[PDB]
Amino acid sequence: QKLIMGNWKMNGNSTSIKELCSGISQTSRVAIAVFPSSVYVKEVISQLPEKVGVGLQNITFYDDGAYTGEISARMLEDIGCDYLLIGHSERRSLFAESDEDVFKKLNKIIDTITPVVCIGESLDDRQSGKLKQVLATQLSLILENLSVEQLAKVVIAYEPVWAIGTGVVASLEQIQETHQFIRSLLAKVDERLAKNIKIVYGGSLKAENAKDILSLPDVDGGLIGGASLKAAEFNEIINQANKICTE
Template identity: 45%
Template sequence: MRQALVIGNWKMNGSLQQSSELLHTIDGAINDKITAEIGVCVPFVYIDLARRVLGASKLKTGAQTLSEFKSGAYTGEVSADMLVEFECHWVLVGHSERRQLFSEKNEALVLKVIAAQKAGLMPIYCVGETEAEYKSGDRFKVIDGQLQSLLANRDVDLNKLVLAYEPVWAIGTGMTASPEDAQEVHAFIRELIKNKAESIADKIRILYGGSVNANNAASLFAQQDIDGGLIGGASLDARAFISICQKA
C-alpha cells in the first residue's frame, strides 16, 4: 500500500512574514486525521525559516530545484549538500517551469536526480506535456521521452524517487485533467516503470499536479494510480492546502 503524498510548491511567492505565518498555520492544522505524508517546497531564502519553524513536524521542507554539481564556480547555484545542511527532505526536479523558462533538459535533470539521491534528498521528478503536444496526440510520446533518460541511467535509484505528472496546460490555468484522463497517464507511467523494474512499479508514488484544489482533490486521489498531489497555487492558502491533504 502506497502512502499518499501531498507536496506544496510555493514557487516564487511570499514575503518573510507571509511565509512564516503560512508555515505556522499549516503546521498547526496538521493532526492525526491526516494520514498523507506532507511537504512544502519553499524558495531557497526561506528554507532556513522552514527548518526553524517546523522542527520535528510531520510537515517536511523541500526545495524547488538544485544544481547537478557538487560544488565549484557555478554562480547562483545551490547544491544538494547545501540543502541537506538545512534539513531539506524533498527537492523538485524538472518542473515544467524549469524546463520551459530555464531550458533545463532531460540529461541535466537526470544528473540532478542522482546528485539529490547521493546527498540523501528525495527527488520528485516531474513530467508532462504542453497544450500543443496534448492536442496533437503526442502526450504519451513526450512523457515516454522525459522518463527514458531517467530509466536508462543505472545511477538512478528508483526506490528513492517520486514521480509527478503535471500537464503543462493545466498548471495555474484553472483547467484540470479529468480524474479518468489523469489516471490513464499515471497508469502509463507505472507501466513504463514496470517494464524497467517490475518490483518497484507498484511501490513508486506518482503525484498529479495541475490546478488541484479542495473541490477536485478527492476525485483525483481516488484513482488507482494517483498517489497524491503536487500543489501550486492552492498551497499558498493554508485552509485550501490542509483541505487537500485531508482528502489524500
C-alpha cells in the same frame, strides 16, 4: 505513505510564510511536504516539525565553486532539506531545463534525500499525438541508467502542462489515463516497484476538486501549487487524503 506536497513557488514574504507555517502546523501515517523559495528555507524548517518534509524547488548539479547564483546538493543538505524538486515545467519551459539536466541533478542526491522528478507534456504535444513519446523521453535517462534500489527512492510528480495555463480542463479519465501510462513505463522495468512508487499529480488541485482525483486508482498524492499557499486550504487538502486513504 500518501505523499501530499506543496510547491510554494516564487510567492510570499517573511511574514506571510511565518503566519502560514503556524497555520500549516495543525494527521495519520501520511506524508506532507513543502517547497518554499531558496531565501526562506531555514526559516520554514524552524517553524515546522520534522514530520513535515521540506525541500528546495531547484538546485544545480555542479560541485561547489565558481557558480554564481546557484545552489548545490551539498549546499542543499546543509540547510536540512529532506526532499528536492527536479524537472519542474517552469524551469523546463522558462529556462530550458533538459532531460540531461534532470538526470545530472538527480544523480547528485539519488544515493542519499528523496528526489521529486517532475514530468509533463505540452498542449501541442497532446494534440499532435506526442503524449506517450515525450513521457517516455522524459523518463529515458532515469529508467535506463538507474536500478530498482534507486528507482524506489525517486518520486515522480506528473504535472500535465496541456491543462496548466492553457485553460483546457482535464477530465478524470485522461488524468487516470496518463497516470496509468506513466506507471506502465516503469512496469516495463519492474512491476512490484511500479505498483508501489509514488506518482503524484501536479496539475491544478484545489480544496473543491480535492477528492475524485486522489480517489483515482493511479494517484499517490498531489504536487499542489497555488492551493498550497493557504493553510486553511492546504490542511483541508491534507484531511481529505487522510480520510480517503484510511477508509
